[PDB]
Design a protein around this ligand. Structure first.
Ligand SMILES: [Zn+2]
Length: 36
């Protein structure tokens, strides 16, 4: 079942978001833990 994007080591605990840099992921979450 085609799903998620494999590659980068750092993966998001929420979505299938993966990044090569840690700091990058950190900011990515800043949005996950926030909504209107
Ligand atoms: Zn995410």
């Amino acid at each position: 079942g085609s799903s998620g994007s494999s590659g980068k080591p750092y993966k998001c605990p929420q979505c299938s978001y993966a990044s090569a840099i840690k700091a990058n992921l950190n900011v990515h979450l800043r949005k996950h833990t926030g909504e209107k």
